[PDB]
Symmetry: C3
Subunit: 616 residues, 3 copies
């Protein structure tokens, strides 16, 4: 009487009543019962709900497919939906045959069911991956052990952020916000740390991190740390339109080696033509440093570079054939700017390095063959010199008489420079306005020295306490110098050597003995070698205590003249009869030293007359 | 014997011994046994531990709430704690009656138990959500299938980031750091990509993304890509204090259509009054472009706008009734600035568009009725003109005599402009300092042209290689011009037309033949139409090779005078007896052309005398 | 029989066939069976696969260790791998003895198994933590309830982001990208919100948030909100090189209290020396505000501070012993700058506060003992005054004659200031170029007032519609004033008091009656108290309608002279015979009022001669 005791045990397993279990036998009414039993396979299954009266059984096969008068039903599938499983003996490794959807095969302490066609044979030595894979239509993991292992794997294998859907502003419903992944959202920013960058002061070679970061296509790179990012691999080529952003000017990009030939970054165009200049980028909010003097960056055939709030230390910037470069709010310590143009084989010219709101100590600006160097609202302290311009090819062919380029220096301060604050050769169409200069004391040098200048304006500047003259002009022609003050300089205020057609107007020269440093300036203006012509002094207020206010040949032939300069005689038209003006205007007065009388040109008589009206 | 075989199967189910299972009937000693059985419901339950001797059973009700001599216990609740469940036949959808806390009802292949008040019937077609919801006191999901679906759902529906607690710096314990969600932390930044923005070169209409981003309340928007963000929907109104940030000047916000009337963005105040001006914002580090010429942005009744490191291409900025606008470090290619004020019906004025550290090619600045337009440390190349100012309405009511506004142009470069670099009408109280101008060669135009000027200063500029005159002043009164250089211009250096009371001081005029371009300038200064009065030339250094140094009527009545200009005689008081000064200063010297002698005014005798001292 | 019905119940439990269950007894062939049963313990276990024929049982102990002729097997271990468990009665709290690896003990409705040595006895009142902990070799949680609780705990306790492995750019394989955690990646940025900051208008004290954020080592802090961040705790000391970034100038950092002595932030160096100055940082893109007037920030012994795109409201910045401070693109409303240097006990000097592209209304700049205050491209409106400089120690010791410092003011606009636009004391080597000034109308004050000035240049400025004089110089020596325009001022254009050796050149004075406001200026230049010497006026274009063009004593001893000023007589050499010049230059012309004739000094004869050449 084995059957009803079997029905009892099955009922206890399924938590149903004893009379709700039935053996499958053909033709029976399946209605009302909740569990059916197969004698051949000795497997039990829950029956689908709502089997109506008169529904009779036809067949029940190895795959737990139950066929009856009303239709068919997969009891294996139903068991799965109800999480009623049988865990088969053995495992994937030793092999087994899967016949039913609710049969589980253990692999590595984890359970899997087959979702594909049945029956399914797994050979000995199989894995779920080795026998059809994991997913719909294949192996599907079941239960606690499998889930725990899978959760641990995906969280720790790096795939999880890509799986997590993200929408900005959730749980709030925001119109237009789209679904992305947490991976993608996080990828919105790139830090050097993402490529192995570390501010561990030389343990990590951050040069490599930069290289790999840029190689990925990234352009805008942030530094997380406040420490030193050591750089040990030279000549990392920057991509076009880079932007490297430090952590609020805290971290350092630093070379720690001893090789002065080391260079951190290169920026390199394909050629000298404008369509070959590589587009530059931004360095900002960081320190660029080296213990030894280096050229930290080398730029060749480049355009549109920016440096903003960068602290440079022993780190010179070298550019050759460069066009439009901004240094803004930078602090330059022992960090020269070196501008060249010899790589421009087309025009041999570079353009517009610009400095604004910068502080410099021991950091010269040295540009050759460069047009429109501009320095505005800057302070420069110490160094051998502050600003230097050079022209490499000085020879010209007629009708050209001179070669040079404009510089624009405005409302800037140049202080305690050891040599010249300004050492300007080939300065043409330059405007130099409202600057303060105090330089050259350490080497007895002029505060500013312009050698080779044409058609420029130097306006409203102050030159004080310089090591020689405040300003010396050598080989400067057709230029204007108005409103400048020349105070307390060692040897003189303003000096000229072999100049032609200059206007020197207003301003003041002398010594005001202001606390903080001055020499007793002995000379006001001097044409030092007495070989300039067309030098015009008008309205200059000279300190009466000046030993020599003006040193200048103002005889009739030199075209040098003085008008209304205090302590200095007005230039009078005078000289021998031979030196009478050839084509004087009407009523022109000339003191004839031969005759010892004033004479006047009479336009009507076409003769010189004395005051009595008689011809001489 | 059905009772002891049932007890055995139950024992095997719970994994206890056979003599540790008991049937419920009143009065029985419950001690020592581990599982109790209910004959009526045919359900088995674990017994609570530590039931001591002499404790006997009293009742066992509908829900396995068991009452005995020591007290009562909820075996259903106990079963839950032990995860010992019964999965009911059928499902939620077919409807069911839930009776016990350890009973599970399947919905969608997932199991749920009821945690609230019992019993409760679920109707056919019900879900956990439709029948009391999911949570404490309600439906609680149970088991593998439910957990897997919930985890899978939660990860992919966007709700997961909000569930993850985040605190900055973990696992390090950082004082003051608070718990947020990963969702909140991620929402700290807004990218255009978050609102469907895509740099797919015209496939996505990013105008919509901008609109929806701003509507959410977002103000500061970043661009992730380095490609082209197409813009196809015109006139997107910006919110107050926007900030749009490109990816290190790599990506383009670009109009790809052919409609020249297209505009990307509008900024619009509520009215003309100062309390109605909409506060502007920042565009930075990006390209704004169009293949056809457009006004990319239209601003009306606006204040405090900024553009920094923006590359403009064929994209004009049009502002009407605007107040304080900054262009810094921008590159303007074929991208005019157009400023108007006719929408200001209160004061009819716009204020302070400012340009600093900008490069411009073919990009004019054209402002009407605008005060304090300022251009500093800028470079402008080509175009029909560089700077133009206009006063739309010129009428004055007496005693007003003139209408105009100041412009401030400082240390800037204007090169190869086709027409005038400066075309300035209604320039009043202007300061123009240390600029370099070379313009007008293509159209035979003056480098700079000021028509209608009052009380301005133009100081220390250089005008070289211009298409006509370097600078022409027409209808300019009571203004100063010191230290300017006028070199190698086609027709002349400096010209005046119908001017009154001007000072022209120092500087220089001529040609220095510097390599790079020049004309042989034929004229220095010319009062071209001989109709100016009170024109004073002092201390100007002229190139002696100049064909015409000065063209000016300096006869006694004109108030025009020259002093210390090289190659030009000092202006002498001269003329007929009829033209003797009416009230001369003491000892006034006058050359009388009628008499042909110099005469001197004696203040004591009140007469003109000759040099011999006789009255004439 | 009891044995085969037990075998049946076991078979139904494991889902195997009845003849596949066998009882353990020594010597029996274990081959073919799938489940073995221990009658002593009344426990059933699955058997390992591949037990071959002729393999006979030897022993089976309490730990379910099975020994047979071929070898041994741990059935408890096998059961775990197959997830076939027995849940023991009771719980951790009541204590139990764990015998088999597949035995589970409940703690707090969650299940655990023992992975360590067996047997394992847990005393009453135990937890998994109290009895060996959780992990390999110890307690391991099992099943649904345990997993759900662990997932919920880990997700909500803040530890989850640290567990999620992250690599930039996944699933794309990017060379050089390294694995990090989601926690670390999120930690790349710091927002004030991360430390409890909230823009809830005074409910949250954000001062504390800043303090704790900075204490963590964070330097760069962002503000998420657009609202008001209330600040209620004074004197938060900033770290070196902070950067506080607002949300596109939307949010306010605001003091909402009523204590006018309140200060938000301090920045404090360790001493007066340069290596002790605390390195400053950046405030940008935000509003700093207060309802009452406060000094929002106090800086002492500091260097290199920046404020960019900051809107100040009632918030004065007070710095003492400060060096290099930038205000760029700022808007200052009722927000003075106060600079002092008395804390510098070494040199008593502060350096270079600089203002660029700023707008100010009612916000004076007040610096004492400060060198190189620089204002460029700025607009200042209203206030009692705009710019004031003072020197604290005015006494000097011979040979020093004066004490002062340079200011550099360039291309800036000063409008409708109630008092002086510039109130400059101790101005030395200053350059003031291309500015527009209209001030003092409310208090009948000069537009600009320099009291105590040496060796400075004031060039190409416009002074219009001022409340008194355009500019008054008191105790100014050896300075230049060229190209300035003085228009429509109430009392006069340019005035001097006790000055010495000044050049006043070109420019223009008068009234041009341009719509927008003017006075009828009555005076051009006036030496108001007739006590200046060496005052030189050259080439100034005066409005002919001026009542007084020049008021100046130009008698021979004063060294004051006028040349080429319209409507003003040239200073000519004249006087009595006794007053003939001692040591005259060659050909010197002198009008002798005694004789009533001009005479000329002949250098050869060493005599004065008349025009006829006879000695007088
Ligand atoms: Cl002589």
């Amino acid at each position: 009487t084995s059957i009803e005791v079997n029905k009892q045990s099955i009922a206890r397993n399924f938590g149903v009543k004893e009379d709700e279990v039935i053996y499958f036998t053909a033709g029976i009414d399946l209605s009302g019962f909740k569990v059916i039993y197969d004698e051949s396979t000795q497997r039990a299954y829950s029956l689908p709900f709502g089997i109506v009266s008169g529904t009779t059984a036809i067949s029940l096969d190895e795959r737990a497919i139950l066929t009856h008068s009303a239709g068919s039903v997969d009891l294996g599938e139903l068991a799965v939906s109800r999480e009623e499983y049988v865990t088969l003996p053995g495992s994937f490794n030793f092999g087994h045959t899967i016949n039913v959807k609710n049969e589980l095969l253990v692999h590595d302490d984890k359970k899997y069911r087959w979702d594909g066609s049945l029956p399914k044979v797994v050979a000995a030595g199989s894995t779920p991956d080795s026998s059809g894979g994991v997913g719909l239509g294949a192996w599907l993991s079941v239960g606690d052990a499998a889930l725990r292992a899978e959760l641990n794997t995906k969280v720790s294998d790096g795939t999880f952020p890509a799986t997590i859907k993200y929408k900005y502003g959730l749980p709030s419903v925001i119109d237009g916000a789209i679904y992305r992944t947490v991976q993608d959202k996080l990828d919105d920013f790139v830090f050097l740390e993402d490529f192995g960058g570390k501010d561990d002061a030389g343990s990590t070679d951050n040069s490599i991190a930069f290289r790999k970061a840029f190689a990925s296509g990234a352009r805008k790179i942030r530094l997380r740390g406040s420490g030193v990012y050591g750089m040990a691999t030279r000549d990392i080529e920057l991509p076009a339109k880079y932007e490297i952003i430090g952590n609020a000017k805290n971290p350092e990009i630093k070379y720690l080696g001893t090789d002065t030939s080391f260079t951190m970054f290169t920026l390199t165009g394909s050629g000298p033509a404008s369509n070959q200049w590589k587009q530059g980028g931004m360095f900002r909010d960081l320190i660029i440093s080296s213990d030894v003097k280096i050229n930290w960056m080398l730029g060749r055939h480049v355009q549109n570079l920016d440096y903003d709030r960068v602290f440079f230390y022993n780190s010179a910037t070298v550019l050759n054939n460069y066009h439009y470069v901004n240094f803004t709010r930078c602090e330059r310590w022992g960090s020269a700017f070196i501008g060249r143009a010899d790589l421009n084989t087309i025009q041999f010219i570079s353009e517009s390095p610009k400095f604004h709101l910068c502080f410099s100590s021991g950091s010269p600006i040295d540009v050759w063959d460069t047009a429109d160097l501009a320095i505005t609202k800057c302070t420069m302290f110490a160094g051998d010199y502050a600003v230097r311009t050079r022209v490499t090819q000085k020879q010209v062919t007629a009708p050209d008489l001179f070669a040079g380029y404009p510089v624009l220096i405005t409302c800037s301060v140049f202080d305690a420079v050891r040599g010249h604050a300004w050492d300007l050769e080939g300065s043409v169409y330059s405007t130099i306005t409202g600057n303060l200069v105090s330089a050259g004391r350490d080497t007895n040098s002029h505060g500013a020295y312009i050698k080779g200048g044409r058609s420029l304006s130097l306006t409203g500047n102050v030159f004080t306490y310089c090591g020689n003259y405040g300003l010396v002009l050598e080989d400067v022609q057709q230029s204007g110098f108005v409103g400048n003050v020349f105070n307390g300089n060692k040897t003189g205020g303003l000096g000229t050597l072999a100049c032609k057609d200059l206007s020197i107007v207003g301003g003041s020269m002398g010594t005001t003995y202001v606390r903080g440093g001055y020499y007793t300036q002995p000379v006001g203006y001097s044409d030092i070698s007495s070989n300039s012509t067309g030098i015009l002094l008008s309205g200059v207020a000279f300190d009466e205590a000046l030993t020599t206010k003006v040193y200048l040949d103002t005889s009739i032939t030199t075209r040098n003249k003085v008008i209304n300069c205090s302590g200095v005689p007005d230039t009078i038209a005078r000289g021998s009869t031979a030196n009478r003006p050839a084509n004087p205007q009407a009523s022109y007065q000339y003191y004839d030293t031969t005759l010892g009388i004033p004479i006047w040109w009479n336009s009507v008589s076409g003769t010189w007359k004395n005051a009595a009206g008689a011809d001489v």
